[PDB]
Tab-separated table of C-alpha atoms in Angstrom:
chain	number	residue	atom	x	y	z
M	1	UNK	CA	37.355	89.450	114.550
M	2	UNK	CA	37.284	92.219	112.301
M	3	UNK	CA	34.892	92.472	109.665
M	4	UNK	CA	34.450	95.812	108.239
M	5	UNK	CA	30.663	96.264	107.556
M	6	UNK	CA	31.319	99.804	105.444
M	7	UNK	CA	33.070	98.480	102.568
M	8	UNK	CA	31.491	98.095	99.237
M	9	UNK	CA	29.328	94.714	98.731
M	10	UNK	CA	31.053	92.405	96.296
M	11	UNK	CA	27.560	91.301	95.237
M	12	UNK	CA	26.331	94.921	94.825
M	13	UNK	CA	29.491	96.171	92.265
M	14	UNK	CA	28.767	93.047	90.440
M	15	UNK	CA	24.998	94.456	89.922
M	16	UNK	CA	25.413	94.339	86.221
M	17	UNK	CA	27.702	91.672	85.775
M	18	UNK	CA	26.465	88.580	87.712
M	19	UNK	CA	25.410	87.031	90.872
M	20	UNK	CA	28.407	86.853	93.081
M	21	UNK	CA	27.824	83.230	95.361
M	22	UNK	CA	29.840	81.454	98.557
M	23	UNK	CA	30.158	78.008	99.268
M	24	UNK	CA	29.575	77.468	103.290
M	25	UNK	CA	28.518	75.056	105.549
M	26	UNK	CA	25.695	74.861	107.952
M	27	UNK	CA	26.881	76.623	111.119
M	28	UNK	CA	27.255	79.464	109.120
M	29	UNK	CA	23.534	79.959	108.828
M	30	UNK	CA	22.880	80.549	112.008
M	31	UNK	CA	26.436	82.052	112.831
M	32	UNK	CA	25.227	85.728	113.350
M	33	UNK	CA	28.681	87.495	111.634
M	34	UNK	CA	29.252	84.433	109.000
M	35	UNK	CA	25.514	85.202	108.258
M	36	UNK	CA	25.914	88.905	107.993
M	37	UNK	CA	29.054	88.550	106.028
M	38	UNK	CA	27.232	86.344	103.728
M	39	UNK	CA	24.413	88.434	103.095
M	40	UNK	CA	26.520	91.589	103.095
M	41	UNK	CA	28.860	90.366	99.943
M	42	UNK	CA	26.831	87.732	97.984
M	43	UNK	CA	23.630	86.947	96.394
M	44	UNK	CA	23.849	83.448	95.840
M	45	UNK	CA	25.168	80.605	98.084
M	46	UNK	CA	26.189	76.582	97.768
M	47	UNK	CA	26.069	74.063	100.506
M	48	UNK	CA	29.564	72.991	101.009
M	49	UNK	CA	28.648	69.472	101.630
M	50	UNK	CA	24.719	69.311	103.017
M	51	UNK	CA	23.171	68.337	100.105
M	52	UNK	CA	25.915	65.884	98.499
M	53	UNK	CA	24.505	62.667	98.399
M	54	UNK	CA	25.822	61.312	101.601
M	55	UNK	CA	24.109	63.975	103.723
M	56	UNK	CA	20.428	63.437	102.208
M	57	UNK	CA	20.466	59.823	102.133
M	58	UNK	CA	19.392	58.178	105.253
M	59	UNK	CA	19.490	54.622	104.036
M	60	UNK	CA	17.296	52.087	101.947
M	61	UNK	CA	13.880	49.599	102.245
M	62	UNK	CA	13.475	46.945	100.717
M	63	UNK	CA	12.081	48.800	97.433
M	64	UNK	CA	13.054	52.541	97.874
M	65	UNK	CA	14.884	55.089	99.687
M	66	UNK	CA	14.946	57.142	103.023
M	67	UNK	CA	16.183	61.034	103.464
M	68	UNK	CA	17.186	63.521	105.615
M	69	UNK	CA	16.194	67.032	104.865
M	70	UNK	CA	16.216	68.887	107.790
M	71	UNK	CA	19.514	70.863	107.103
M	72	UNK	CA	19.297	70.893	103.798
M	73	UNK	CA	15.829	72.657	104.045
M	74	UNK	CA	17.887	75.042	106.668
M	75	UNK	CA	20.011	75.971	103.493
M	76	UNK	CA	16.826	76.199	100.666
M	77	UNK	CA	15.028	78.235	103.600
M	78	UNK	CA	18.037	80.869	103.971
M	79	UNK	CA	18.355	81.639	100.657
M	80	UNK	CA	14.419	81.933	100.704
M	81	UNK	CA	14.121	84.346	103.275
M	82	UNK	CA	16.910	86.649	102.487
M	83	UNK	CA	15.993	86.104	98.500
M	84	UNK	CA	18.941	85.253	97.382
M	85	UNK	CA	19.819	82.050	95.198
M	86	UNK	CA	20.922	78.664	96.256
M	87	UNK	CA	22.991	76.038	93.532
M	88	UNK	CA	21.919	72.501	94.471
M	89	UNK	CA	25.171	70.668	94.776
M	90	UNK	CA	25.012	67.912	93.554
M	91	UNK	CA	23.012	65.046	92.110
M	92	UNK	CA	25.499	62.535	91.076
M	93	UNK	CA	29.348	62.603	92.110
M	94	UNK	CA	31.876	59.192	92.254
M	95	UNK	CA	32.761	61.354	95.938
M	96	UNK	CA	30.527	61.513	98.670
M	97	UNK	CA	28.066	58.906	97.968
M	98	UNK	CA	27.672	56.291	100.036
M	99	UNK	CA	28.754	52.798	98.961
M	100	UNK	CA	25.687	51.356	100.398
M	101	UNK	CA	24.056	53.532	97.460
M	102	UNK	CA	25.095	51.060	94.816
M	103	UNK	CA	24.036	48.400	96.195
M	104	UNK	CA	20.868	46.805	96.819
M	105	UNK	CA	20.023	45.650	100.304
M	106	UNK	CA	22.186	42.511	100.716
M	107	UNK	CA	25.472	44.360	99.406
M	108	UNK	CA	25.403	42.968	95.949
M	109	UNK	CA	25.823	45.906	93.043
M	110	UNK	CA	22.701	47.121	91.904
M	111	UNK	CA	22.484	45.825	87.521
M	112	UNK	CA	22.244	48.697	85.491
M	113	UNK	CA	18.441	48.951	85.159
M	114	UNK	CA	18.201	48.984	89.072
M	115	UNK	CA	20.938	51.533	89.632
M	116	UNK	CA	19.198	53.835	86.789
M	117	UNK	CA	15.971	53.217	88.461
M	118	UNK	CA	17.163	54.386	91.781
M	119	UNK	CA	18.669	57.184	90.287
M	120	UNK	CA	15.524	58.266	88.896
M	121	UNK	CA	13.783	57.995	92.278
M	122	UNK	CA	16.674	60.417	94.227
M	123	UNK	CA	16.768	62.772	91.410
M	124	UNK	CA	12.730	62.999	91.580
M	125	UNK	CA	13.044	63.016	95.132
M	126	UNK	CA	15.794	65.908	95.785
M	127	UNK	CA	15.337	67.989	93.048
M	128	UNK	CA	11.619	67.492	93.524
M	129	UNK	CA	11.554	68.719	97.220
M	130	UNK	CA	13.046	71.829	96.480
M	131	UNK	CA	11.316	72.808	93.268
M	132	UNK	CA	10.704	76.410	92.462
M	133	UNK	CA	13.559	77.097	94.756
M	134	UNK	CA	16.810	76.343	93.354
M	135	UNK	CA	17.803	78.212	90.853
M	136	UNK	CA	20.734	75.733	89.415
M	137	UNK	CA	21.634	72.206	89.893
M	138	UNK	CA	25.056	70.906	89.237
M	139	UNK	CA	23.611	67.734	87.931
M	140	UNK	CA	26.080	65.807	87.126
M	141	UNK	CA	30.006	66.304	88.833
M	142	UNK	CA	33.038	65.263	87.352
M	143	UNK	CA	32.366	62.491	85.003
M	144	UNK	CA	35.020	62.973	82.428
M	145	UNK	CA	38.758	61.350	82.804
M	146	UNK	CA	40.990	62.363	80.112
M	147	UNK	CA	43.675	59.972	80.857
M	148	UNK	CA	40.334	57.577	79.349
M	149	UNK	CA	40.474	57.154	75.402
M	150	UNK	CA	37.030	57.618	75.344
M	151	UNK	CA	37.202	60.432	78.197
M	152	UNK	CA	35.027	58.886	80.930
M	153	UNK	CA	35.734	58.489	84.538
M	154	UNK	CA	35.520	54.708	85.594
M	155	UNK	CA	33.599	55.370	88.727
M	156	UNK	CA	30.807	52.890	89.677
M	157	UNK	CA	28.120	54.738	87.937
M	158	UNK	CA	30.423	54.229	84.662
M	159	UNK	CA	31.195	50.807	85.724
M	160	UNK	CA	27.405	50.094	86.479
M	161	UNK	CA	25.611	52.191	83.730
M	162	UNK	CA	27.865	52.836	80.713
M	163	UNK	CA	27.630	56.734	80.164
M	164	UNK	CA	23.734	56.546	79.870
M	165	UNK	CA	23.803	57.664	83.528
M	166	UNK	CA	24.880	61.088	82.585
M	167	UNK	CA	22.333	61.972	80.222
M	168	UNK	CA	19.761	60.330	81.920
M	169	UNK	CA	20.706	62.511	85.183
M	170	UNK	CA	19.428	65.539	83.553
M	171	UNK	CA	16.569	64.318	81.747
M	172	UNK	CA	15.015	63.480	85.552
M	173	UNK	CA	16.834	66.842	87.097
M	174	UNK	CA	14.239	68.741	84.367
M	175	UNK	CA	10.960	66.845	84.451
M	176	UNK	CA	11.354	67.001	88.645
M	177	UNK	CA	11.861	70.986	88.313
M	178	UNK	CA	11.308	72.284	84.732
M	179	UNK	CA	12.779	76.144	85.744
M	180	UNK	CA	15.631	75.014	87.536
M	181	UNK	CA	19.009	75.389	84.982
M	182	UNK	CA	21.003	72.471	85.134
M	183	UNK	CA	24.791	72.144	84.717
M	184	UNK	CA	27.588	69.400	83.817
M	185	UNK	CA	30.540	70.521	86.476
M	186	UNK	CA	33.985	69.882	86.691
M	187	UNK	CA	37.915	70.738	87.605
M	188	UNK	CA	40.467	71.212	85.544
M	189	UNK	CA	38.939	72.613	82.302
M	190	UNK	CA	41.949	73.804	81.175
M	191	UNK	CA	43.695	70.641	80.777
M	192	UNK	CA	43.410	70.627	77.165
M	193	UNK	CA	42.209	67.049	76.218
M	194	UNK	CA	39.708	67.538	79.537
M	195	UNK	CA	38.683	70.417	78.214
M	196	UNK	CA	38.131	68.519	74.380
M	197	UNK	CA	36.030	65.964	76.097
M	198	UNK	CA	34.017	67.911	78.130
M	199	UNK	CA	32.885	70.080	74.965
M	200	UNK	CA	32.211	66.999	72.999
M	201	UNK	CA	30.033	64.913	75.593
M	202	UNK	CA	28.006	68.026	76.325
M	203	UNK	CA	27.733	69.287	72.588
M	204	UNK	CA	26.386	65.566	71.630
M	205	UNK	CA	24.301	65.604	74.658
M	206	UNK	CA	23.004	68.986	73.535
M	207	UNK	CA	22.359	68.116	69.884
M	208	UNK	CA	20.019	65.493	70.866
M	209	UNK	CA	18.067	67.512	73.122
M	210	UNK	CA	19.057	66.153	76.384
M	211	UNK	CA	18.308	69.077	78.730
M	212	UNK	CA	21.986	70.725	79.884
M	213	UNK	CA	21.916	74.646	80.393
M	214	UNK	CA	25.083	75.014	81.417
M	215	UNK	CA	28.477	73.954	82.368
M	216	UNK	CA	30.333	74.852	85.653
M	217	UNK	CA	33.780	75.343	85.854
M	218	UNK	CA	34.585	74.721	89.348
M	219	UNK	CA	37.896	76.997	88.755
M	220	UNK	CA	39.988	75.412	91.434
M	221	UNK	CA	43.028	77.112	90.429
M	222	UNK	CA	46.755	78.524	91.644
M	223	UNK	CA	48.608	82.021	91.220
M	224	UNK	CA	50.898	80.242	88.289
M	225	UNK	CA	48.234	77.976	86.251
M	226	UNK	CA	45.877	78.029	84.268
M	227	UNK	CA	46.409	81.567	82.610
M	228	UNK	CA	43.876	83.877	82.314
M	229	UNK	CA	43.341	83.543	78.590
M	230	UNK	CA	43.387	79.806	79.552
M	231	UNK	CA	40.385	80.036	81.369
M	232	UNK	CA	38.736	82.421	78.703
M	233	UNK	CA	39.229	80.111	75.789
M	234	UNK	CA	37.288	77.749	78.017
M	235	UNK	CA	34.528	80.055	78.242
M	236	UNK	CA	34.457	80.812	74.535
M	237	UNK	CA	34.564	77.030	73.563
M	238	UNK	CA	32.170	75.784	76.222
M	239	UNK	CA	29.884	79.066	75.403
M	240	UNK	CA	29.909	78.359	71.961
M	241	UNK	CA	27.231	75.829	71.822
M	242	UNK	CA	24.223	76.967	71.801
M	243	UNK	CA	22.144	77.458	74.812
M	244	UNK	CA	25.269	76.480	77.516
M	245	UNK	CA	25.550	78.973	79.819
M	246	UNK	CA	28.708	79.470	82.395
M	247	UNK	CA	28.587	79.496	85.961
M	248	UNK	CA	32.190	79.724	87.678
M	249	UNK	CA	31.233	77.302	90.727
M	250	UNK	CA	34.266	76.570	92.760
M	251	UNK	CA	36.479	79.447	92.484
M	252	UNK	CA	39.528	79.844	94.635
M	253	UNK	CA	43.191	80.380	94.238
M	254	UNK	CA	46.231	78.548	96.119
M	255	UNK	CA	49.224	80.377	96.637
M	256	UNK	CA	51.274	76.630	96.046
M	257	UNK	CA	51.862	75.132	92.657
M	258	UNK	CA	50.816	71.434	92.296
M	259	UNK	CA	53.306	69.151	93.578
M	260	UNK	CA	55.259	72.348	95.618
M	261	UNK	CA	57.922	71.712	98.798
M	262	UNK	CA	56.726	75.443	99.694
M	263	UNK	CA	54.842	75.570	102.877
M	264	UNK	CA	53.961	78.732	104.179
M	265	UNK	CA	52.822	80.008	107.817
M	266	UNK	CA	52.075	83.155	106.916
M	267	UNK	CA	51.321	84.477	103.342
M	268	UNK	CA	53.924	86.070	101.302
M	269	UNK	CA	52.921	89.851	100.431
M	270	UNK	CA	54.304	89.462	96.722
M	271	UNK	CA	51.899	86.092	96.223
M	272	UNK	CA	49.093	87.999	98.134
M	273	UNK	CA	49.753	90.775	95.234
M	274	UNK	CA	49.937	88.383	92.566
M	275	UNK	CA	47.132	86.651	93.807
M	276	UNK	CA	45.184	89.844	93.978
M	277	UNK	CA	46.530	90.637	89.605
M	278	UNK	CA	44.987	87.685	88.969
M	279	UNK	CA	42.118	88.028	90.083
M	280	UNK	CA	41.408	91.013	89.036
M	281	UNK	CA	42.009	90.135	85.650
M	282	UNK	CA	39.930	87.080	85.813
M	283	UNK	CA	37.356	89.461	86.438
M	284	UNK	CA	37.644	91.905	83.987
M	285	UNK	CA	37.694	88.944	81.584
M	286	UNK	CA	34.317	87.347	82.967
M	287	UNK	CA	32.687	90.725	82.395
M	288	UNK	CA	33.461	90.817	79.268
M	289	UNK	CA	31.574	87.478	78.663
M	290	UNK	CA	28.699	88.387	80.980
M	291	UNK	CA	26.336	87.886	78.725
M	292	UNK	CA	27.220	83.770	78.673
M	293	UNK	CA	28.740	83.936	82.499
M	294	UNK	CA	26.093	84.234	84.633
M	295	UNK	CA	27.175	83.674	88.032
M	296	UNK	CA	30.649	83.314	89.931
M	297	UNK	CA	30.963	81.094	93.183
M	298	UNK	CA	33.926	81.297	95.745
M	299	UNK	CA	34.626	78.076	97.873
M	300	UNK	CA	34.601	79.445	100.831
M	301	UNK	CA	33.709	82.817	103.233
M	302	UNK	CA	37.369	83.337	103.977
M	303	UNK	CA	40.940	81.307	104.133
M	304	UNK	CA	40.342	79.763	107.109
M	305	UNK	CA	37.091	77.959	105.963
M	306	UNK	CA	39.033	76.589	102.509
M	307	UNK	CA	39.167	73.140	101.989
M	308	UNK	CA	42.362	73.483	100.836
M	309	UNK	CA	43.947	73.365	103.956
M	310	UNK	CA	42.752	70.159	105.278
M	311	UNK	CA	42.866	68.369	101.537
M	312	UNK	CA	46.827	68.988	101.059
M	313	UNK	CA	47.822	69.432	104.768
M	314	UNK	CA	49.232	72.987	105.011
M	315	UNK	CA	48.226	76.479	105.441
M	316	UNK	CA	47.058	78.384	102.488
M	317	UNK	CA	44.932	81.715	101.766
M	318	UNK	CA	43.054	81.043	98.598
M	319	UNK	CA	40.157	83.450	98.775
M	320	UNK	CA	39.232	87.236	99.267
M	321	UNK	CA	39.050	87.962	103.530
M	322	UNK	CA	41.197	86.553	105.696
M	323	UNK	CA	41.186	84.556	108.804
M	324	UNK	CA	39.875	87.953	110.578
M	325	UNK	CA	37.135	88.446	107.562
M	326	UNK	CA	39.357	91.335	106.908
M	327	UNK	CA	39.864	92.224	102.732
M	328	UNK	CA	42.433	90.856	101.583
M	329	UNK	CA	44.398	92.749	98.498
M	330	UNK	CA	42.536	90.557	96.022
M	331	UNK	CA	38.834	91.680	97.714
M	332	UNK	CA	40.298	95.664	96.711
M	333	UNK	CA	41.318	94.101	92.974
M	334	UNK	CA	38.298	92.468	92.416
M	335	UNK	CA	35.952	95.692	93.295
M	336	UNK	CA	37.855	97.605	90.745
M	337	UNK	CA	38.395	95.004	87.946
């Protein structure tokens, strides 16, 4: 290990800017220098995976639905204590749902009605348990597929529901917790006809008063794509309808491109410095649109953690400490961007 406890708090220089958040899991609650690291650099966190539908969901009775809480209160109860915010992530997701959730009690799929209804009842449920406390919700996760003509993802709530599930989502999400702000998230928002579609669904949503606040871009991006002014015509589009608000949920930064033969044990100092440019001027640019980006999110405490590693099946160093929670070049960038 070596943390250094005396350099400047990532969350602190960002003061003025924006909440600065990390995505971790649950042993790093009660981890005592993952905690301290946490609470040393950022003022907002996101549950990895501990409050994804497949970790609250116990199972089903015949007419409703059973829950388990316990870590995900450890999680709502941390940021409590230490007064910092928690993102709820997330209501409704094609991943990490169980099957079983689809379903009524003999396997068959749930008709639309019955699927909505049981929607209604988790979303009143969740978002209910922790009202007052949660500060965001990523409501709805990844709906859109722009290889679609008319941009939706065929997942089973599509299949099941038609789109109604979407807009329905957040109508629940705000009578179960009026003050929380609620957000449409996604990947890939620089994909220009993804990009299209998500604008349109959420400005039609919008117009008719369905209750979005925001959208998330999860930012899950590499050293060579999307550019920076990429990602900021994104914000400017997405920010341009009125009352959508940006959090940056997901952020990290591979050292690969898509599709690459590289494979690195250790990383590269000229992609660590690139990696560290880039960042810095991703940055710079989301200060200049503070006033519509509100808070930034890294997936993960350090390179180790990412869930890149274990997703594509090689090494990778994607964030801002290393392995030894030492700062990496982009950590020094980012301070002075």
């Amino acid at each position: 290990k070596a943390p250094d406890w005396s350099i400047p708090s990532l969350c602190e220089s960002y003061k003025d800017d924006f909440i600065i958040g990390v995505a971790i899991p649950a042993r790093c609650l009660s981890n005592d220098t993952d905690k301290r690291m946490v609470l040393k650099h950022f003022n907002s966190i996101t549950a990895e995976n501990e409050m994804k539908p497949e970790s609250l969901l116990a199972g089903q009775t015949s007419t409703g639905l059973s829950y388990r809480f316990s870590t995900a209160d450890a999680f709502v109860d941390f940021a409590s204590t230490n007064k910092i915010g928690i993102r709820g992530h997330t209501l409704v997701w094609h991943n990490q749902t169980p099957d079983w959730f689809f379903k009524d009690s003999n396997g068959q799929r749930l008709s639309k009605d019955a699927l909505l209804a049981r929607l209604k009842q988790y979303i009143y449920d969740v978002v209910g348990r922790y009202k007052g406390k949660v500060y965001a919700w990523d409501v709805v996760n990844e709906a859109i597929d722009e290889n679609q003509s008319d941009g939706y993802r065929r997942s089973t709530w599509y299949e099941i529901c038609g789109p109604e599930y979407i807009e329905k989502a957040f109508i629940w999400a705000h009578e179960a917790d009026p003050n929380a702000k609620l957000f449409y998230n996604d990947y890939n928002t620089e994909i220009s006809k993804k990009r299209e579609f998500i604008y349109n669904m959420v400005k039609n949503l919008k117009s008719k008063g369905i209750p979005i606040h925001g959208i998330g871009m999860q930012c899950h991006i590499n050293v060579n794509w999307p550019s920076v002014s990429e990602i900021e015509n994104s914000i400017k589009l997405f920010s341009s309808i009125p009352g959508i608000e940006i959090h940056i949920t997901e952020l990290d930064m591979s050292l690969y491109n898509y599709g690459s033969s590289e494979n690195y044990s250790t990383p590269p100092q000229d992609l660590l410095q690139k990696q560290a440019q880039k960042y810095k001027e991703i940055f710079t640019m989301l200060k200049k649109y503070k006033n519509v980006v509100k808070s930034v999110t890294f997936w993960g405490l350090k390179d180790d953690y990412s869930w890149l590693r274990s997703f594509y099946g090689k090494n990778d160093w994607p964030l801002l400490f290393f392995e030894d929670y030492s700062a990496k070049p982009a950590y020094w960038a980012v301070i002075e961007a």
